[PDB]
Design a protein around this ligand. Structure first.
Ligand SMILES: *[C@@H]1O[C@H](CO)[C@@H](O[C@@H]2O[C@H](CO)[C@@H](O[C@@H]3O[C@H](CO[C@H]4O[C@H](CO)[C@@H](O)[C@H](O)[C@@H]4O)[C@@H](O)[C@H](O[C@H]4O[C@H](CO)[C@@H](O)[C@H](O)[C@@H]4O)[C@@H]3O)[C@H](O)[C@H]2NC(C)=O)[C@H](O)[C@H]1NC(C)=O
Ligand SMILES: *[C@@H]1O[C@H](CO)[C@@H](O[C@@H]2O[C@H](CO)[C@@H](O[C@@H]3O[C@H](CO[C@H]4O[C@H](CO)[C@@H](O)[C@H](O)[C@@H]4O)[C@@H](O)[C@H](O[C@H]4O[C@H](CO)[C@@H](O)[C@H](O)[C@@H]4O)[C@@H]3O)[C@H](O)[C@H]2NC(C)=O)[C@H](O)[C@H]1NC(C)=O
Ligand SMILES: *[C@@H]1O[C@H](CO[C@@H]2O[C@@H](C)[C@@H](O)[C@@H](O)[C@@H]2O)[C@@H](O[C@@H]2O[C@H](CO)[C@@H](O[C@@H]3O[C@H](CO)[C@@H](O)[C@H](O)[C@@H]3O)[C@H](O)[C@H]2NC(C)=O)[C@H](O)[C@H]1NC(C)=O
Ligand SMILES: *[C@@H]1O[C@H](CO[C@@H]2O[C@@H](C)[C@@H](O)[C@@H](O)[C@@H]2O)[C@@H](O[C@@H]2O[C@H](CO)[C@@H](O[C@@H]3O[C@H](CO)[C@@H](O)[C@H](O)[C@@H]3O)[C@H](O)[C@H]2NC(C)=O)[C@H](O)[C@H]1NC(C)=O
Ligand SMILES: *[C@@H]1O[C@H](CO)[C@@H](O[C@@H]2O[C@H](CO)[C@@H](O[C@@H]3O[C@H](CO)[C@@H](O)[C@H](O)[C@@H]3O)[C@H](O)[C@H]2NC(C)=O)[C@H](O)[C@H]1NC(C)=O
Ligand SMILES: *[C@@H]1O[C@H](CO)[C@@H](O[C@@H]2O[C@H](CO)[C@@H](O[C@@H]3O[C@H](CO)[C@@H](O)[C@H](O)[C@@H]3O)[C@H](O)[C@H]2NC(C)=O)[C@H](O)[C@H]1NC(C)=O
Ligand SMILES: *[C@@H]1O[C@H](CO)[C@@H](O[C@@H]2O[C@H](CO)[C@@H](O[C@@H]3O[C@H](CO)[C@@H](O)[C@H](O)[C@@H]3O)[C@H](O)[C@H]2NC(C)=O)[C@H](O)[C@H]1NC(C)=O
Ligand SMILES: *[C@@H]1O[C@H](CO)[C@@H](O[C@@H]2O[C@H](CO)[C@@H](O[C@@H]3O[C@H](CO)[C@@H](O)[C@H](O)[C@@H]3O)[C@H](O)[C@H]2NC(C)=O)[C@H](O)[C@H]1NC(C)=O
Ligand SMILES: *[C@@H]1O[C@H](CO)[C@@H](O[C@@H]2O[C@H](CO)[C@@H](O)[C@H](O)[C@H]2NC(C)=O)[C@H](O)[C@H]1NC(C)=O
Ligand SMILES: *[C@@H]1O[C@H](CO)[C@@H](O[C@@H]2O[C@H](CO)[C@@H](O)[C@H](O)[C@H]2NC(C)=O)[C@H](O)[C@H]1NC(C)=O
Ligand SMILES: *[C@@H]1O[C@H](CO)[C@@H](O)[C@H](O)[C@H]1NC(C)=O
Ligand SMILES: *[C@@H]1O[C@H](CO)[C@@H](O)[C@H](O)[C@H]1NC(C)=O
Ligand SMILES: *[C@@H]1O[C@H](CO)[C@@H](O)[C@H](O)[C@H]1NC(C)=O
Ligand SMILES: *[C@@H]1O[C@H](CO)[C@@H](O)[C@H](O)[C@H]1NC(C)=O
Ligand SMILES: [Ca+2]
Ligand SMILES: [Ca+2]
Ligand SMILES: [Cl-]
Ligand SMILES: [Cl-]
Ligand code: NA
Ligand code: NA
Ligand SMILES: [Zn+2]
Ligand SMILES: [Zn+2]
Ligand SMILES: [Zn+2]
Ligand SMILES: [Zn+2]
Lengths: 693, 693
């Protein structure tokens, strides 16, 4: 009864069966079918042997198209006749043409409206795309409908950016340049997005708030809800996603200015003119959106499984991933949920033979992730006192695969050593690495840019259910999945993401026929939970935080040093931050020595508490500026792309575009304030590792 | 080596000697003499046997009169001749007439100015005094100088209230009605305030922020400071305190309206007319303030002593009280500091004979309390991560006596049982209770209004150094001192509070000749620290929180029920709060049973952690509305009187004066929101006591 027993019990064939089972019908959040699936998971986790399995439910703001009043976009002529209409649905894939309750493509939480106007093409609608438009090109988006390609960044940032540019609507589309890999066929004959395929997804800017109506507090039965007008993160202009057949029709007539350069051109046979409006012959034609989706408070269900710890039941290691899908969820999330299901089954096998982990393991099937991480966030809001005093670690478990090339891990520095050690003990599933370790294949395919013989591990970003646990509550967090080769494959994400084409057959035929990558990811995720819940000394190495803190301090200082004159004028020094990082390095080194030298369970637990509370020490209870739920001072989601992690985010945002600020004294004053906050927090975290008295 | 050994080692004669030692010269915060005293305490605590004794220093905003440009108030005539001037200093007491560096009476943090105008008398300048003036009497304070009597509430609230009434200055004075007990002589021949006596004190409204320039973060060497204009809690109009000889001169000529009733009349031979301005003959005369005090960033020093725990060194029991004084500090704070000094000495005696407490005891000599709890707050800001994960309890130790009648205890419900049990084991020092317990004399003199055979224990308010530990960080806190009989003695505080007359001789001659009340208070405070640091199971009874939560829920519901029609219209229910309190009662009862039945140190420490984190569970990281540093949902300082505790403060303030709000729907909506927050927090705190897995 050790890790090897746990790992060996995991079967690829079981993960295949579960994936099939979870993907036959849609499981949209707030729907009866997803509630049925919740009850099924609850039943099976009980059967599998967990001590308790409960549903935790909340009533949250969700968004759905109107069934009798479909969303669509038109080209209208001067008479007002709609001469072109975008599709009302994606052509269903082979054998699914009769499946009901496929939600049609829509942008969740769009307000209703029917705006009419001239089109401006804004590339990926990134901060720098708008800078280029407004500052360099002198194009005004005010009162225009913007059309943007999907890709590069989170769609909610695109919508925010369009809105602050004064757009009156946004059209999102999938360009083949970003969603069609050269030499691969469209679904069903390959893994590419067809011209009628469309990516669903919410366009909120929640910044960690969870349910838009109840920021800070669980959306329970007696919750007081904000009015819609005061809700968090809702867009103020209508938005709708389309495919590249329909996008071609909308782009082909575009006039005004040429694209500023080739990074603005996708792969369609159109000029990619920025606009505004259409070329001469069609200059009186306009674009009209028709959006009728409604926001509604709807009940959602998390499944929470508990396997009580034998020695420290008041210490919680959490494995959590979501269950709700846009349609069938073939990759997102069921390729993760099937992996969790088999992990539970394996732990349960051991439990039935009399074993218990040292610490409590909690297993979560979250609801409403697709609508803003709502299930994980409301539950963490409800249980925040328990999680901040008892939470050892959170391992996420959304999609197990986004490619078939190599491992991807994003995690706190505290888990680097755990991940290196675990992967050295696992077999690579890769062709040409038979009998080699996962560590070897991973390091070869994804080398660290700093360190020879080490793999690359990214910072945690967001756009997934670890966000409340890591950036709000400061619980050490990690995620892992198989991924594509980004060096040779330039497209954004996997092509069929959040489309009807993301099915069981997508995975079984193209991504992972033998379910070996799924099994590899079950071993990584399950292996991590096993070590975290069972190792006598928590498997965190504080010295790895010291190394990255120095790298981040160098980075942020380099950004500021682009403005040497202002640093002189305003006396901007990074000395305090570097001093704090030096102290952290020295104190962590001494703590590591002590952790090596000590039969005494109090000294042990005292030291496990120092390891556990070290991630927690990076939390500032005041939050980051205007983002009260992003409280971690080292890591926040990028203010320009929610998916990307930013380091020293407080100083980063204070420096961003600082040369354009009206009051340089005020702006540089705020840079110095953020330096102070960062240096203080680093020193305060270091001091939690000092001898306690 | 048990509690009795600790208690027996404490000597009245030692406390007398220390008090004498600490009171020969002024120890104003930020002055060289208070730094010298800090170094002396540090030396002696080392000598006494503590493991480490450090100074923790900060650079904070302090306020001092200008030595070459004195503050004073005048009656001016139409020509501009100053026909009456208030005193420049209090007549020094016998034998101190040559002591230098007595700070003259001033209101710390007053801005500079020389406003001229007509006087309005506003009674105690309470919220209801201003309501009576503006609403009932129709008197407009806009552009007037207000004169208010000291007493009833914290002076900072008076100044806030005057400022929001549009006053252009405030004069504070001590009325004999509030500071002269019938049949007792003025200092030096009794304990009464003489006509030339004046009460110093800050007039900030910090709401827990600490140093006005650095809210949230310690005022360390690299701190970024706000500009003065953005500082927290500074008054916007000049303020100055005077004695009743000078007040008589300012009040005797007052015209306009009569006092509305006898609760507006003090004891001087004047009419107590509200004004504005003077009676006919003198109607062209005006009042002129001259205030030249300056705010300056000044270094302050805390002394921090550590006695490392033998078994749980990472658990902290804190005994802390301040060292800075307005002048000699005969009562405030040295009657407390001398008691702490003897407590340290006694613990050190045991330590030298080989004993250690189970948990770590930290001893603190705080600086700058008189200027806004600045020393305790900056240090707690620096060490917040350590205190919130390790802080068992905080026992305050400011003035040991404010009378000679009976015990006064204000503390969390979690300490009620500890206090009842301890006091049953201590001898009463009271005449007529020889050979009886302190519990017996206390209960007889100060009976609980709810429960026969029990003593009254007040809620913690504020205006002292526990505020950061309790209302910000949620560490279980308590205070205890000897006090007066409030039933028969109607004056505010003790008469010589914050005056030059508060000397060693005041205490030795009038308050506590034999130092027996001092010794009794050393036993209560030291006994509490001893039990908290040494009991195997933390000496907190969660069921006492359940009883008070019900009492507070009844109270707040009764307040709301004054508005039955609005409760109908807006569907205002307290059901959720009562349900939460019921659940708390049931879960706490079950936790208490478990705490009775368990050789297992993990189960023990797990359960000690649940006891320790139970106060912490009442903290809301979002704070109370517009008061981010008051985070405890059950207790906050009254928004009308910082000294007084308020229960369910969020709901209380939402209901206060609600009948006067312009938008009843909005106001009742916020009542319901606060009900939700309170019910949720109570339920969440209850759930920390549930079985952990
Ligand atoms: C990284 O860790 C190191 C510790 O190894 C910290 O070093 C401290 O740095 C501060 C400077 O920011 C030093 O502060 C200075 O303290 C002097 C007096 O300190 C005495 O007392 C303390 C107890 O509190 C002892 O520990 C200490 O050894 C000393 O005996 C002051 O006199 C200094 O103030 C004077 O100079 C400054 C700067 O020029 C002026 O602005 C002032 O007006 C004044 O004249 C100063 O405040 C401190 O002594 C150092 N501690 C130790 C133990 O060496 C780093 O701060 C830490 N990095 C971060 C980011 O925290
Ligand atoms: C004091 O402690 C008690 C527990 O002893 C708590 O009681 C819970 O109270 C809520 C009501 O606020 C109950 O919620 C209801 O749950 C029903 C389904 O719950 C099932 O599943 C759970 C697992 O999550 C089981 O524990 C439970 O026994 C049930 O089998 C819902 O169907 C109810 O919703 C319906 O009615 C409401 C109200 O009329 C409608 O608004 C809805 O639209 C819907 O039709 C409802 O949500 C809960 O069941 C109770 N729990 C238990 C264990 O009994 C108190 O909440 C607590 N007090 C506070 C302040 O927390
Ligand atoms: C693009 O779509 C519009 C609107 O059509 C409606 O919405 C779609 C998403 C689908 O659900 C459609 O089935 C649905 O009709 C088309 O314009 C519309 O055309 C219809 C029929 O030609 C008009 O209906 C009426 O017909 C009778 C005549 O017997 C009269 O009583 C009325 O006067 C009216 O003409 C309808 O008004 C018109 N709607 C709008 C909003 O313009 C459009 O033809 C289509 N374009 C294509 C396919 O190129
Ligand atoms: C109330 O106090 C004022 C101001 O007096 C000053 O401030 C006090 C707090 C103390 O520190 C005083 O020592 C200090 O003077 C008095 O009015 C002031 O009177 C003086 C002297 O009479 C005036 O000084 C000048 O004197 C020479 C004449 O040789 C001329 O050069 C000047 O023209 C001027 O007269 C001073 O101007 C005047 N100041 C003000 C601000 O009005 C006031 O007499 C006193 N009232 C009492 C005791 O009733
Ligand atoms: C995915 O897998 C689950 C679990 O294996 C399947 O659900 C299970 O389906 C069986 C067959 O429908 C159910 O058993 C039945 O029970 C009813 C009475 O309750 C009885 O009438 C039948 O004769 C039969 O014995 C079982 O309830 C159900 N189990 C759970 C835990 O839900 C599910 O059908 C699979 N879904 C797909 C799409 O393959
Ligand atoms: C990942 O694996 C590495 C390599 O095994 C682990 O580091 C190793 O940890 C052991 C156990 O703490 C260290 O052993 C110690 O050696 C010293 C003698 O120098 C002795 O004082 C102790 O009693 C103990 O035996 C070992 O030195 C260390 N090896 C290296 C190369 O660092 C690492 O801890 C693992 N990481 C995690 C998170 O588990
Ligand atoms: C309050 O009590 C303290 C502690 O007893 C007194 O401070 C101590 O005073 C003595 C006598 O001045 C000091 O000893 C002296 O040392 C110097 C050299 O350092 C030497 O020149 C003298 O001959 C003498 O031995 C001692 O330093 C000092 N102790 C401490 C810890 O500060 C203090 O005087 C008392 N204050 C009052 C007002 O009574
Ligand atoms: C303040 O003093 C009271 C009175 O001594 C303490 O309550 C007493 O605590 C003891 C020890 O936990 C309880 O004894 C228990 O009795 C049951 C049998 O019914 C048994 O299961 C246990 O093994 C244990 O012997 C005792 O019942 C209880 N007495 C009362 C009247 O409640 C109280 O704990 C003290 N408070 C603090 C904070 O120390
Ligand atoms: C979906 O859209 C339809 C419009 O075709 C809405 O139905 C109409 O709503 C208006 C305003 O409430 C009523 O005056 C009409 O009588 C309704 N017409 C019909 C034909 O039903 C409908 O409210 C929307 N549905 C949802 C669920 O929001
Ligand atoms: C105390 O008040 C005096 C005024 O009597 C201030 O001294 C004057 O300040 C002004 C403005 O800075 C100068 O122009 C004068 O030359 C000063 N006069 C004298 C006679 O010194 C003084 O600044 C104040 N002191 C403090 C410590 O704030
Ligand atoms: C863009 O257009 C609007 C309205 O037509 C105008 O008010 C605004 O100032 C314009 N902005 C720029 C930067 O040209
Ligand atoms: C799977 O791997 C092969 C071999 O490298 C590659 O050609 C193919 O594109 C991969 N499939 C997917 C879905 O990435
Ligand atoms: C009080 O006086 C000021 C200025 O003289 C005036 O603007 C204000 O409205 C008055 N307020 C009331 C309540 O009478
Ligand atoms: C001390 O107690 C006596 C006796 O009750 C009382 O008359 C006297 O006023 C008290 N002294 C003080 C300073 O309260
Ligand atoms: Ca919420
Ligand atoms: Ca501060
Ligand atoms: Cl994931
Ligand atoms: Cl006190
Ligand atoms: Na398919
Ligand atoms: Na005296
Ligand atoms: Zn997902
Ligand atoms: Zn998704
Ligand atoms: Zn005091
Ligand atoms: Zn005081």
């Amino acid at each position: 009864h050790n890790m090897k027993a746990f790992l060996d019990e995991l079967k690829a064939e079981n993960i295949k069966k579960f994936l099939y089972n979870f993907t036959q019908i849609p499981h949209l959040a707030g729907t009866e079918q997803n509630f049925q699936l919740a009850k099924q998971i609850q039943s099976q986790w009980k059967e599998f042997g967990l001590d308790s399995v409960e549903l935790a439910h909340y009533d949250v703001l969700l968004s759905y198209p109107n069934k009798t009043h479909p969303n669509y976009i038109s080209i209208i002529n001067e008479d007002g006749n709609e001469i072109f209409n975008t599709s009302l649905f994606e052509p269903p894939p082979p054998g699914y043409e009769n499946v009901s309750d496929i939600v049609p493509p829509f942008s969740a939480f769009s307000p209703q409206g029917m705006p009419e106007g001239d089109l401006v093409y804004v590339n990926y609608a990134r901060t720098e795309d708008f800078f280029k438009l407004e500052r360099d090109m002198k194009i005004n988006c005010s009162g225009k409908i913007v059309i943007a390609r999907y890709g590069k960044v989170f769609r909610g940032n695109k919508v925010k950016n369009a809105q602050l540019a004064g757009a009156k609507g946004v059209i999102l589309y999938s360009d083949p340049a970003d969603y069609f890999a050269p030499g691969v066929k469209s679904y069903p004959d390959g893994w590419n997005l067809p011209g009628g395929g469309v990516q669903r997804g919410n366009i909120l800017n929640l910044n960690g708030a969870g349910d838009p109506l109840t920021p800070g507090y669980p959306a329970n039965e007696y919750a007081y809800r904000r009015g819609i007008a005061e809700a968090v993160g809702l867009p103020s202009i209508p938005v709708h996603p389309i495919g590249y057949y329909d996008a071609q029709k909308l782009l082909e007539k575009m006039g005004g200015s040429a694209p500023p350069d080739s990074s603005w051109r996708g792969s369609l046979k159109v000029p990619y003119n920025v606009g505004p409006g259409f070329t001469g012959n069609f200059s009186t034609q306009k674009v009209k959106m028709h959006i009728h989706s409604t926001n509604e408070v709807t009940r959602i269900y998390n499944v929470i499984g508990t396997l009580r710890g034998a020695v420290e039941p008041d210490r919680y290691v959490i494995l959590g991933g979501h269950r709700d899908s846009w349609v069938f969820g073939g990759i997102d999330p069921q390729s993760g949920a099937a992996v969790v299901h088999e992990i539970v089954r394996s732990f349960g096998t051991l439990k039935k033979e009399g074993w218990r982990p040292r610490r409590t393991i909690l297993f979560a099937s979250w609801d409403a992730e697709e609508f803003g991480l709502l299930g994980s966030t409301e539950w963490a809001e409800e249980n925040s006192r328990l999680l901040q005093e008892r939470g050892v670690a959170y391992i996420n478990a959304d999609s197990s695969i986004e490619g078939n090339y190599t491992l991807r891990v994003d995690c706190t520095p505290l888990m680097y050593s755990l991940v290196h050690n675990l992967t050295k003990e696992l077999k690579s599933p890769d062709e040409g690495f038979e009998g080699k370790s996962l560590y070897e294949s991973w390091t070869k395919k994804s080398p660290s840019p700093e360190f020879s013989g080490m793999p690359r591990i990214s910072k945690l970003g967001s756009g997934n259910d670890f966000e409340v646990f890591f950036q709000r509550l400061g619980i050490a967090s990690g995620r892992a999945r198989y991924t594509k080769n980004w060096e040779t494959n330039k497209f954004s994400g996997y092509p069929l993401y959040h489309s009807v084409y993301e099915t069981y057959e997508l995975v079984e035929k193209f991504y992972d026929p033998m379910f070996k990558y799924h099994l590899t990811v079950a071993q990584v995720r399950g292996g991590m939970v096993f070590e975290l819940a069972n190792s006598i000394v928590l498997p965190f190495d504080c010295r790895d935080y010291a190394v990255v803190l120095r790298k981040y301090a160098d980075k942020i200082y380099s950004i500021s040093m682009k403005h040497p004159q202002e640093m002189k004028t305003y006396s901007v020094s990074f000395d305090s931050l570097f001093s704090a990082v030096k102290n952290f390095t020295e104190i962590a080194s001494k703590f590591s020595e002590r952790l090596q030298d000590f039969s005494n369970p109090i000294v042990l637990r005292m030291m496990n508490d120092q390891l556990m509370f070290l991630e927690r020490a990076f939390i500032d209870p005041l939050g980051l500026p205007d983002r009260p739920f992003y409280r971690h001072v080292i890591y926040a989601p990028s203010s320009h792309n929610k998916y990307a992690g930013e380091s020293f985010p407080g100083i980063y945002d204070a420096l961003f575009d600082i040369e354009s600020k009206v009051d340089p004294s005020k702006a540089w004053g705020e840079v110095k304030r953020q330096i102070y906050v960062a240096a203080f927090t680093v020193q305060a975290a270091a001091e939690t590792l000092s001898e306690v008295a």
